[PDB]
Amino acid sequence: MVEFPEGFVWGAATSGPQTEGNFHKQHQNVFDYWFATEPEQFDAGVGPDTASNFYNDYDHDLALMAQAGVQGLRTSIQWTRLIDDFETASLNADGVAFYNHVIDSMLAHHITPYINLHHFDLPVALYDKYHGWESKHVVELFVKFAEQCFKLFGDRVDHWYTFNEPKVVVDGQYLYGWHYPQVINGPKAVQVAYNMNLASAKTVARFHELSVRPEQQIGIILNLTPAYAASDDPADLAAAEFAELWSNNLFLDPAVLGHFPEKLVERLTMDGVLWDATPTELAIIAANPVDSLGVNYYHPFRVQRPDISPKSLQPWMPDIYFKEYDMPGRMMNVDRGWEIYPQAMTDIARNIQKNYGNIPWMISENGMGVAGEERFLDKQGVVQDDYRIDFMKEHLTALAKGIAAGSNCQGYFVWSGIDCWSWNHAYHNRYGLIRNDIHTQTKTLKKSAKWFAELGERNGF
Amino acid sequence: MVEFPEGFVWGAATSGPQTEGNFHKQHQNVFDYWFATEPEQFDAGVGPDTASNFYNDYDHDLALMAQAGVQGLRTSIQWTRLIDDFETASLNADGVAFYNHVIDSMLAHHITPYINLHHFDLPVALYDKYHGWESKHVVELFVKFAEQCFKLFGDRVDHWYTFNEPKVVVDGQYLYGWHYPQVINGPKAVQVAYNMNLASAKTVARFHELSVRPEQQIGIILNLTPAYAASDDPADLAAAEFAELWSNNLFLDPAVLGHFPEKLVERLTMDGVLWDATPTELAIIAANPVDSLGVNYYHPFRVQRPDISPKSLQPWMPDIYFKEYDMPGRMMNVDRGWEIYPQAMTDIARNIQKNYGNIPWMISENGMGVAGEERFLDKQGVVQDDYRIDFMKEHLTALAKGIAAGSNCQGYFVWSGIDCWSWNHAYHNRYGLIRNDIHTQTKTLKKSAKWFAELGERNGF
């Protein structure tokens, strides 16, 4: 009734920081330090020190994911676990040993590894010493960490990603207080977006200098969620224009086309907040676009005119040009606060096909987070998460229309395999096909896990 | 006709425990204790307590080696003489002063020092308290002893070695009963081989943190004799394959390549006898390969299939996979019971050249032992050891072929300079260019010693 291309990958996505726990980890990332000093900023004071116990229980957790139909698992390597000295990227022997264990264990459970290098987990010491992603020297230290990952694990990992959602690092660390250091500074944010695009292009370049087999490829993972104008009012259309350039093109265009979006550069310049770039850096970005795209999609983005004129006396923010809009009658993931709009999948697919060379891409994250899932347990402690199955069906239906129209989508990864630690929200909302009882770290397939395994067997539903 | 590279080093090899005697030595090594409790185990009841009287007669002993053409002398410092308290590697002042005397007397006689740190002489107290090389705390105590050597003597010693043939310690102490404590335990032997490799890597690390001169270099002395298959039968080829990994790669690969041979560790793992290692220790081994290689070689090594299945019910030993083979037609040194086959030196030279990066190396032991050399005294009182001269001609001819094909061999060290004490064989077989009458400690050049002096003036023959 709804079928998918031959070879389509059915996978799951997590990250190191949200699964491993902090057991024996050498360095604190910014979230580790945030929790150590202000535990009250986290749901129930549950931080990342244990998370979903993946450091200790990886082998059996991978077996459960394989049970759940996870043919590919995408997670991340922590800079703060792998590296001893950041300046030279010397190696923490115990951390290298741990990532070889989980990659080997993925293979033994017949899971294809997809390895992302960075997922919101900047080392706090590099923020204290250089201001983190503001520093083009920190950019270089990142590339040297990437180089080690490629040399250590490239022999049995084909599929890599530089970053998960750099835009969330920019927004979170420098615009809205979501991430420690909670800086609130538009111009810095512009430089950080620049610096992270540059780090990604420099990592792509080093990846291909070091690759040995043709099937090795490196990509990036972004939100491509479209900006719908609230109305056809010119002021709402103009707000949606800028929201689109700034939330999507800022990263999509340099990663895939090789250059920054022309209209955005012009607006940033006119406002006096343009990044500092050099011709040599821009040439690196132009010469090393990603091999593939990971699309994270959860909810649409709707936007109307700003309440006050953008020429008002205020600190510069991208938000001076647009304000978020609530559509009456929207479908809502309420205990979460997000709109549910599957059709955006189709728009994204068409946009990639028409405007971005129909580059090979995957849905790298799609999922629904729900609170208090103990209420939906049945007589055997199996969460009856039909809502999650229906949510997956609605978005997969939309995806398949994009594919039949000709968009080069090659896989679908659910967020997430096993309930994992959702930053300051901790375990308030669950996303997994597999429930984790975090008091005992005992995990059990949900109803959606068996549906997912069957979806992969029939390559459809 | 047979010539050698410019700057080739013609030297002699010995050790401290076989030359010094035990004169005023603070501690017993395992051979001292063994002789003191079981003198019946030593040929003619002769033990290490006087040996070749080097403690008392070092100055004129060195003058004789100088006469005999020894351009560089390799010997060893005894842990049991240099160290007072083993736990802190505190210094015994008379022992420190003794080795300062011999080193300065070497330089005064224009003999270049080659100092080895360990030659079968573990302190017996460390076996009693910790079971010796079974203990990674003993491994740390060895590095403190070595640290003291580099700081005490590194101002006028460029050339160092960590161990003379750890395999002989493993075989002797833990497999075949050649060395006190005479333990017969395969699994323990495997741990000991691991620990000593680890000890050597840590000593290389400490050495280069304390080096000041670029000429300073440290290596290890190994027996690299190939394991020749008895025939082309698969079972004999398989036996030789294990024999080679076990007898050579076990040490050659960590020392030079920075890692253990994967086929060996696979086999030890299936057999349930793999050593206990940590990721941090393995990183030290990988980070600190030796600077050069000392190759000892005396006679070939031939191997056939085991008599019974290695699946038989029997304690684990390396030998369940191979058995020694006697080849019909072999060329024999009949009295000693050793086959003569100088082409092995060419096989070693090529293997170093093609598989180990043509690392700088020397032949650190080659020599011929013969009993009852009184039989060849002439009226001037000099041993006419023409057999010893031909043997060197034969093996140097083979070595030159290896050098001509491109192997980076840089020296040739005769075992030995002066007749010395050969463990339980004591003075039964004589190996030196210089005879010692051990009743009077009177030493006399043999015929081979003028020939060796002539050889180095003429860097050929």
Side-chain angles (χ1 to χ4, degrees):
Chain A
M1 198 269 300
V2 173
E3 34 183 56
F4 282 84
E6 163 95 34
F8 200 77
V9 175
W10 306 100
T14 25
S15 67
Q18 303 173 259
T19 55
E20 301 175 352
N22 275 328
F23 304 96
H24 302 295
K25 203 174 69 176
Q26 188 178 155
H27 306 284
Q28 307 180 132
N29 59 41
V30 290
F31 275 94
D32 301 324
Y33 173 89
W34 201 8
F35 178 77
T37 54
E38 320 175 43
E40 63 284 356
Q41 299 296 326
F42 298 76
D43 188 49
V46 177
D49 305 330
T50 290
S52 288
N53 200 36
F54 192 68
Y55 190 83
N56 295 115
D57 221 34
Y58 56 90
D59 192 70
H60 179 79
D61 288 341
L62 293 174
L64 297 163
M65 280 182 260
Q67 262 184 65
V70 173
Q71 326 171 319
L73 173 63
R74 172 227 137 176
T75 183
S76 75
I77 292 182
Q78 293 195 72
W79 199 350
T80 50
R81 175 172 313 272
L82 192 73
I83 293 317
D84 173 31
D85 175 27
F86 298 127
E87 309 290 344
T88 64
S90 70
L91 294 181
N92 179 297
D94 287 319
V96 167
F98 164 73
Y99 289 114
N100 270 322
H101 283 327
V102 340
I103 286 167
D104 288 339
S105 175
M106 293 161 120
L107 268 7
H109 287 108
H110 298 112
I111 301 177
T112 311
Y114 291 69
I115 276 59
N116 167 45
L117 299 181
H118 195 71
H119 193 132
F120 312 166
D121 54 326
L122 173 80
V124 76
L126 296 178
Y127 177 79
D128 298 331
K129 193 159 172 173
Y130 309 106
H131 281 0
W133 288 120
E134 297 170 73
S135 166
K136 291 180 179 187
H137 175 251
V138 165
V139 168
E140 296 294 322
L141 305 184
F142 180 78
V143 171
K144 293 144 70 131
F145 157 67
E147 171 176 323
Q148 293 282 34
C149 296
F150 301 148
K151 301 204 255 202
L152 290 160
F153 319 110
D155 60 306
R156 56 232 119 92
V157 172
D158 284 329
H159 307 281
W160 296 78
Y161 293 108
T162 58
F163 288 92
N164 170 276
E165 315 203 80
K167 174 80 171 27
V168 172
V169 181
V170 177
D171 293 357
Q173 294 191 15
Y174 287 88
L175 284 180
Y176 311 118
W178 306 339
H179 296 184
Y180 186 86
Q182 305 195 276
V183 171
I184 310 305
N185 189 305
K188 285 179 174 182
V190 183
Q191 191 66 57
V192 166
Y194 175 87
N195 283 178
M196 296 181 87
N197 281 291
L198 175 61
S200 185
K202 283 170 169 275
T203 296
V204 172
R206 187 73 60 68
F207 179 85
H208 287 309
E209 291 159 12
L210 290 166
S211 56
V212 295
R213 328 172 281 282
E215 55 276 335
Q216 289 182 298
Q217 47 161 330
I218 189 161
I220 195 181
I221 295 162
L222 313 164
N223 296 285
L224 289 210
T225 283
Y228 299 138
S231 74
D232 67 328
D233 193 308
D236 292 343
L237 287 166
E241 223 152 295
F242 181 84
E244 189 72 38
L245 290 175
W246 171 262
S247 70
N248 299 321
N249 299 72
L250 213 210
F251 290 92
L252 220 206
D253 289 15
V256 175
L257 314 173
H259 57 80
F260 283 98
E262 196 34 68
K263 290 212 59 173
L264 178 63
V265 170
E266 169 198 355
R267 175 84 263 158
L268 293 187
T269 300
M270 291 172 58
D271 291 359
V273 298
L274 184 55
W275 46 66
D276 183 21
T278 74
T280 300
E281 288 168 351
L282 290 170
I284 298 180
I285 285 170
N288 307 98
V290 300
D291 302 307
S292 81
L293 191 65
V295 172
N296 285 3
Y297 175 77
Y298 289 94
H299 62 79
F301 190 32
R302 324 189 170 263
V303 153
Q304 63 189 312
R305 68 178 313 166
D307 287 343
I308 80 185
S309 160
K311 305 193 281 216
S312 296
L313 302 318
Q314 59 191 334
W316 190 94
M317 295 297 252
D319 305 66
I320 67 181
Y321 292 109
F322 60 88
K323 163 191 179 133
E324 183 151 30
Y325 170 73
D326 295 322
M327 179 181 71
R330 72 216 167 247
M331 174 127 310
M332 279 297 291
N333 177 358
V334 351
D335 49 60
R336 174 57 220 155
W338 277 348
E339 174 175 12
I340 290 172
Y341 189 77
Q343 297 92 311
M345 300 280 258
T346 308
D347 298 333
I348 293 179
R350 177 191 319 122
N351 180 218
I352 293 170
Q353 150 180 53
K354 287 200 170 41
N355 295 320
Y356 291 89
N358 210 18
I359 191 182
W361 66 284
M362 294 180 168
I363 291 291
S364 46
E365 279 180 41
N366 183 238
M368 160 164 77
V370 173
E373 290 198 319
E374 73 273 348
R375 311 163 292 181
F376 311 112
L377 291 164
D378 77 346
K379 48 162 146 61
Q380 312 82 323
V382 169
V383 173
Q384 305 302 298
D385 58 336
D386 294 286
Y387 45 89
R388 174 160 303 103
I389 296 174
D390 288 308
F391 172 97
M392 256 156 61
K393 273 146 95 160
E394 288 181 42
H395 290 75
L396 281 172
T397 302
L399 222 213
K401 290 172 189 190
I403 295 181
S407 184
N408 196 18
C409 181
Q410 306 189 173
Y412 176 82
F413 284 57
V414 293
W415 190 281
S416 174
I418 299 178
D419 296 333
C420 50
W421 179 77
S422 209
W423 319 105
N424 308 74
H425 302 163
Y427 291 87
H428 184 82
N429 297 317
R430 311 305 187 97
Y431 288 81
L433 309 159
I434 302 170
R435 168 174 181 80
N436 182 14
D437 171 10
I438 65 163
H439 298 300
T440 59
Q441 298 294 333
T442 279
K443 302 132 174 153
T444 320
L445 300 202
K446 300 172 193 173
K447 185 179 176 175
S448 51
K450 194 51 220 73
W451 190 85
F452 199 75
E454 169 194 287
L455 165 71
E457 280 153 9
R458 317 162 306 188
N459 206 26
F461 63 91
Chain B
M1 192 87 207
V2 173
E3 45 194 329
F4 284 87
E6 202 90 339
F8 205 68
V9 181
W10 302 98
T14 350
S15 77
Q18 306 177 259
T19 52
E20 288 163 14
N22 280 336
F23 305 97
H24 303 104
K25 203 174 67 166
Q26 170 166 3
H27 306 277
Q28 300 187 125
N29 69 47
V30 282
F31 273 93
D32 304 330
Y33 177 85
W34 200 10
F35 174 82
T37 48
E38 304 184 52
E40 56 276 18
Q41 292 290 341
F42 297 73
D43 178 89
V46 174
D49 298 340
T50 291
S52 290
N53 195 41
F54 192 62
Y55 184 86
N56 291 293
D57 215 27
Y58 59 88
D59 196 279
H60 166 87
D61 279 4
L62 286 162
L64 295 171
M65 299 190 198
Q67 285 181 36
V70 189
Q71 294 170 172
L73 170 65
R74 186 263 288 196
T75 190
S76 77
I77 290 169
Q78 292 200 71
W79 197 352
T80 55
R81 170 177 315 267
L82 190 85
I83 298 315
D84 178 9
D85 184 358
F86 295 133
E87 292 290 3
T88 63
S90 62
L91 298 173
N92 177 306
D94 295 322
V96 174
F98 164 72
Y99 292 117
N100 269 321
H101 286 334
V102 354
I103 286 178
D104 291 335
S105 179
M106 289 186 295
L107 297 176
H109 289 102
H110 297 100
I111 297 164
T112 298
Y114 290 67
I115 300 299
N116 164 44
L117 295 171
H118 191 72
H119 199 136
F120 311 164
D121 58 322
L122 168 78
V124 74
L126 294 183
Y127 180 78
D128 296 346
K129 178 155 168 117
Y130 299 115
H131 280 180
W133 295 116
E134 294 171 72
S135 159
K136 307 188 158 169
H137 173 76
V138 170
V139 167
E140 300 291 330
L141 295 185
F142 177 79
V143 167
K144 310 201 197 236
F145 158 61
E147 178 179 335
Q148 291 282 50
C149 291
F150 310 151
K151 300 199 296 218
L152 281 171
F153 312 115
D155 54 310
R156 55 235 121 98
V157 177
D158 277 332
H159 302 95
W160 297 82
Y161 300 98
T162 56
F163 288 89
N164 178 98
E165 300 197 58
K167 170 187 169 49
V168 178
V169 175
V170 173
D171 294 353
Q173 288 191 19
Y174 287 93
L175 287 173
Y176 314 113
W178 307 336
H179 299 182
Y180 185 95
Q182 302 191 283
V183 169
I184 310 301
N185 186 316
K188 279 187 186 182
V190 175
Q191 193 70 63
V192 168
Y194 173 82
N195 288 357
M196 295 181 85
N197 276 296
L198 168 64
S200 174
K202 288 165 161 277
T203 304
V204 172
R206 194 88 279 253
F207 184 82
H208 287 312
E209 292 150 359
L210 301 163
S211 66
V212 311
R213 305 187 296 285
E215 311 80 74
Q216 283 179 315
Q217 46 169 137
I218 185 154
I220 187 172
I221 300 165
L222 306 181
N223 184 292
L224 296 203
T225 304
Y228 296 145
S231 66
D232 49 25
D233 194 276
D236 291 336
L237 289 173
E241 170 159 40
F242 185 86
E244 183 103 29
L245 295 159
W246 170 260
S247 65
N248 301 151
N249 296 76
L250 209 203
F251 299 94
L252 216 203
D253 288 8
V256 164
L257 267 32
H259 56 88
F260 285 102
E262 200 44 37
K263 296 65 47 196
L264 220 221
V265 10
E266 173 185 79
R267 176 83 260 154
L268 300 187
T269 303
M270 321 210 275
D271 290 351
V273 302
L274 187 64
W275 46 69
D276 196 319
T278 75
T280 300
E281 299 170 340
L282 290 171
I284 290 171
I285 289 170
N288 297 279
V290 303
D291 296 317
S292 79
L293 212 52
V295 167
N296 300 350
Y297 174 74
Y298 292 84
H299 61 70
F301 183 38
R302 326 206 161 237
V303 151
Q304 65 190 312
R305 66 202 81 178
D307 278 341
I308 73 184
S309 166
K311 310 281 184 213
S312 295
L313 317 157
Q314 61 182 332
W316 187 90
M317 303 278 291
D319 305 72
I320 66 169
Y321 294 114
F322 62 94
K323 159 187 217 191
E324 177 108 1
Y325 173 73
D326 291 327
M327 171 175 86
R330 70 215 166 255
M331 173 87 47
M332 290 308 277
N333 163 18
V334 167
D335 283 341
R336 182 73 181 83
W338 283 3
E339 170 178 7
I340 306 166
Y341 187 78
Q343 164 78 28
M345 298 220 338
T346 317
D347 296 339
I348 308 182
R350 203 230 186 185
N351 177 229
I352 283 162
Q353 180 190 2
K354 295 299 167 200
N355 305 132
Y356 294 86
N358 214 19
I359 181 156
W361 69 284
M362 301 194 298
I363 273 180
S364 55
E365 299 191 17
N366 183 236
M368 167 159 61
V370 182
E373 286 196 319
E374 310 72 2
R375 298 172 293 164
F376 324 99
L377 291 170
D378 66 354
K379 308 152 199 176
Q380 52 160 331
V382 159
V383 167
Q384 301 296 299
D385 55 340
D386 287 282
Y387 46 84
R388 181 156 295 110
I389 303 183
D390 306 326
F391 173 101
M392 284 193 275
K393 279 176 167 174
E394 274 169 355
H395 295 257
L396 289 164
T397 298
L399 186 59
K401 301 216 318 160
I403 290 169
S407 196
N408 190 191
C409 179
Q410 290 173 5
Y412 173 87
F413 277 64
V414 155
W415 188 279
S416 177
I418 294 169
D419 287 344
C420 54
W421 178 81
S422 217
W423 314 107
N424 305 74
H425 287 42
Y427 290 91
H428 184 70
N429 299 123
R430 309 298 178 105
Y431 290 83
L433 310 160
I434 304 169
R435 169 167 185 81
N436 180 36
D437 164 28
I438 62 164
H439 296 128
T440 58
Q441 298 294 150
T442 295
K443 322 222 172 78
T444 313
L445 298 217
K446 327 187 176 154
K447 190 175 170 174
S448 58
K450 328 174 193 130
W451 185 87
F452 198 78
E454 174 72 67
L455 153 69
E457 295 261 357
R458 193 40 294 164
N459 204 44
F461 59 94

